[PDB]
Amino acid sequence: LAAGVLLVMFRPFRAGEYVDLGGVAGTVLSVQIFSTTMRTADGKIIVIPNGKII
């Protein structure tokens, strides 16, 4: 929750921005309270906890 709040305040990335969050890369679909959803270039959806991202 704290990591998600920080990611919402400081914006290292936004919905629609290609990123590489520690070994996983893909367009960011949405940032939520507990985790954010990205869609890899292959076409699969990946959900990452915000704490791990931060």
């Binding site: 292959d42 699969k44 990946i46 959900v47």
Partner: protein
């Protein structure tokens, strides 16, 4: 406490083929053959991107890359069908998949 790679979430996914041919194979002919192969499959979404072009100059072959989108239910089937058709067309057309190559210089004959 870890990533959750969801697959059944998106109804459409992508297939990637890596085809390695000899260094004498005509690039235009290979590209045209691959384009004809992937344009005759009805399970490959034509709206998405269909990329087929030279991707690398390998040690013994030049690797081409083919990328095509299809419904998640037809991914493996289209992969298998396209691979078999690629092999058949390349065999019939003349293109050759090369064995590992090596130049040997003789000495002390």
């Amino acid at each position: 406490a870890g990533n959750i790679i969801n697959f059944s979430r998106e109804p459409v996914r992508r297939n990637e083929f890596i085809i390695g041919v000899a260094y004498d194979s005509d690039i235009d002919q290979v590209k045209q053959i691959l384009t004809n192969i992937i344009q005759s499959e009805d399970r490959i979404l034509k709206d998405r991107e269909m990329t087929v072009r030279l991707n690398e100059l390998g040690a013994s072959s030049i690797n081409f890359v083919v990328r095509v989108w299809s419904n998640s239910g037809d991914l493996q089937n289209v992969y298998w069908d396209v691979l078999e058709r690629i092999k058949r067309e390349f065999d019939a057309a003349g293109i050759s998949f090369p064995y590992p190559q090596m130049d040997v210089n003789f000495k002390r004959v």
